[PDB]
Amino acid sequence: TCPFYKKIPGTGFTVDAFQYGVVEGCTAYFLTHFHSDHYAGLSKHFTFPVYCSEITGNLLKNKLHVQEQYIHPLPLDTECIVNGVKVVLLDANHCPGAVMILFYLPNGTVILHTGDFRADPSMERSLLADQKVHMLYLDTTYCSPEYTFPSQQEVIRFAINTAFEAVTLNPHALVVCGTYSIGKEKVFLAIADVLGSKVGMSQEKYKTLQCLNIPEINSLITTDMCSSLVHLLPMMQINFKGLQSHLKKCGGKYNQILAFRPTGWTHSNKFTRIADVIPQTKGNISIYGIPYSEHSSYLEMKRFVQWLKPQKIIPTVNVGTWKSRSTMEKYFREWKLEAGY
Ligand code: NI
């Protein structure tokens, strides 16, 4: 059935709850971002109001074929009334089009649902600063102190410097980047830019990217693989067998591949600095695993919550085991006791 943590009290609202059939009592279905664990169940057959950002709304229409009449895009940073309740969408610093939702309940309670987010100090100067939030529905993906990772800017600098050196030493090397969803576009775009190439990809993936309102996008991507020296492929194909295969396809235009796998966290983070990362190599193929995250580190999540000072926290991730639930709850208490709320 629909879990309680997908339901917003005192409203007829749900959040990221599209795989339970008709949810009894639900008058509006909010969608925080276009990732499949969250949109699961949507299709052209859906006949209830969907509320979301403009970008998420472009992907609903084009990729899932949801009917225009049921898509209700809202602008960010703007007080909006939905079925008699004041809401606000905010940038979640996750993938394109990803939002957090502020609900202002008729009774005076204020609820923030983060969706999926990477907490940032810039959030402390949005409309969140203007009033008190009583309840926080929190993206707890990396809610444990072992989860450190570098800034996004540091990771992109590593990737750009690595690719530029490799191709300047060998102008017949190909660069390949993995993808399985929207997000982490800066990886392949920043590498393409430093190399003076467009990024080459399949028709399906090009269509996906053309929904994202990225400025000057026609100048950065293409479906002509032959004219491009940065290729995007399915994350599944980022391994030695899949890469040798792909190299054969290019017809002797290239004699080396340098590939990037943007992972979330991986255990070499607890030991290794970004400056010290190394590839796995077999022959003329090298694969780099780089920790580009679009979720909060443990310290970023902690700072956000200690700034916000909510009265109650409802986790939306890792809720499936008693061990994880009990661990999260202990961090919440530490944080509250250290900060004094
Ligand atoms: Ni997500």
Side-chain angles (χ1 to χ4, degrees), residues 1-23 25-203 205-215 217-240 242-247 249-269 271-281 283-311 313-341:
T1 71
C2 182
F4 74 102
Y5 65 88
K6 293 189 187 278
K7 290 169 157 177
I8 300 301
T11 66
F13 306 154
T14 63
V15 177
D16 297 348
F18 294 93
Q19 63 168 300
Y20 308 96
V22 173
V23 168
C26 187
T27 68
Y29 291 82
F30 289 71
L31 181 53
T32 60
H33 68 292
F34 195 75
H35 276 166
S36 57
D37 285 358
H38 304 258
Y39 64 72
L42 272 171
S43 72
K44 68 163 66 167
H45 309 298
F46 201 79
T47 55
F48 297 105
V50 180
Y51 287 85
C52 60
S53 61
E54 185 189 339
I55 287 153
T56 301
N58 297 342
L59 293 159
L60 295 178
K61 168 167 174 203
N62 294 289
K63 295 298 294 180
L64 299 182
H65 304 286
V66 169
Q67 292 172 51
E68 194 134 69
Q69 76 182 127
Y70 306 109
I71 301 168
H72 302 257
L74 309 170
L76 304 190
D77 305 316
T78 302
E79 294 186 322
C80 291
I81 309 312
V82 172
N83 301 351
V85 173
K86 178 160 67 162
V87 310
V88 176
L89 305 190
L90 307 162
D91 210 278
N93 186 40
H94 186 49
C95 68
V99 298
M100 315 190 280
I101 319 158
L102 262 181
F103 300 93
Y104 296 80
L105 264 42
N107 79 6
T109 304
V110 175
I111 297 165
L112 175 62
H113 196 313
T114 64
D116 285 348
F117 90 146
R118 182 165 186 173
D120 197 77
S122 64
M123 294 169 177
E124 306 162 18
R125 305 162 267 284
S126 60
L127 308 198
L128 283 176
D130 297 26
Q131 83 298 275
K132 167 181 194 60
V133 175
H134 300 85
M135 302 182 82
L136 177 58
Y137 287 66
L138 182 58
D139 170 19
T140 47
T141 296
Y142 298 126
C143 195
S144 207
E146 71 269 29
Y147 301 113
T148 59
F149 29 66
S151 70
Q152 285 172 172
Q153 188 271 326
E154 290 174 77
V155 173
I156 288 301
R157 174 94 302 201
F158 173 83
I160 279 169
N161 290 0
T162 301
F164 178 74
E165 180 187 307
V167 182
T168 302
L169 292 166
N170 179 196
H172 306 272
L174 173 67
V175 171
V176 172
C177 289
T179 191
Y180 42 36
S181 63
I182 67 166
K184 306 196 196 178
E185 289 82 6
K186 194 73 181 181
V187 180
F188 54 88
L189 304 177
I191 289 177
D193 178 74
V194 87
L195 297 177
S197 180
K198 292 189 174 168
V199 180
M201 68 202 65
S202 73
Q203 295 186 255
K205 184 73 190 180
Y206 182 89
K207 178 185 179 175
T208 301
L209 302 184
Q210 284 288 166
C211 303
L212 301 189
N213 295 351
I214 286 169
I217 198 59
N218 297 323
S219 78
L220 317 174
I221 56 173
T222 178
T223 62
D224 183 5
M225 310 290 289
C226 284
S227 68
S228 161
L229 65 142
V230 186
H231 301 176
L232 303 196
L233 296 183
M235 199 72 85
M236 283 193 69
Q237 199 164 352
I238 314 296
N239 54 82
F240 300 116
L243 288 168
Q244 289 159 194
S245 180
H246 183 69
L247 191 52
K249 270 161 264 173
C250 291
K253 201 161 191 304
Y254 304 112
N255 63 358
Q256 177 189 8
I257 284 175
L258 180 121
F260 293 94
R261 289 190 345 84
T263 56
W265 168 87
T266 57
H267 186 54
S268 14
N269 269 295
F271 305 118
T272 318
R273 275 165 145 72
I274 193 67
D276 320 345
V277 169
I278 60 165
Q280 273 199 247
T281 296
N284 61 336
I285 295 175
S286 282
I287 299 172
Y288 282 89
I290 60 167
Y292 195 92
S293 183
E294 285 186 346
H295 298 270
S296 312
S297 72
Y298 171 80
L299 292 171
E300 299 165 340
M301 188 184 299
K302 185 177 179 289
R303 179 197 165 122
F304 180 84
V305 176
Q306 280 184 317
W307 173 76
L308 192 76
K309 294 177 189 51
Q311 304 180 346
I313 302 178
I314 305 177
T316 62
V317 183
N318 309 315
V319 296
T321 82
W322 295 117
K323 195 170 159 215
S324 303
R325 283 191 157 289
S326 173
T327 304
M328 299 182 291
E329 289 179 3
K330 289 184 27 270
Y331 292 122
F332 302 150
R333 192 58 63 179
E334 299 185 2
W335 301 350
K336 180 181 163 85
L337 285 165
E338 162 185 52
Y341 52 103

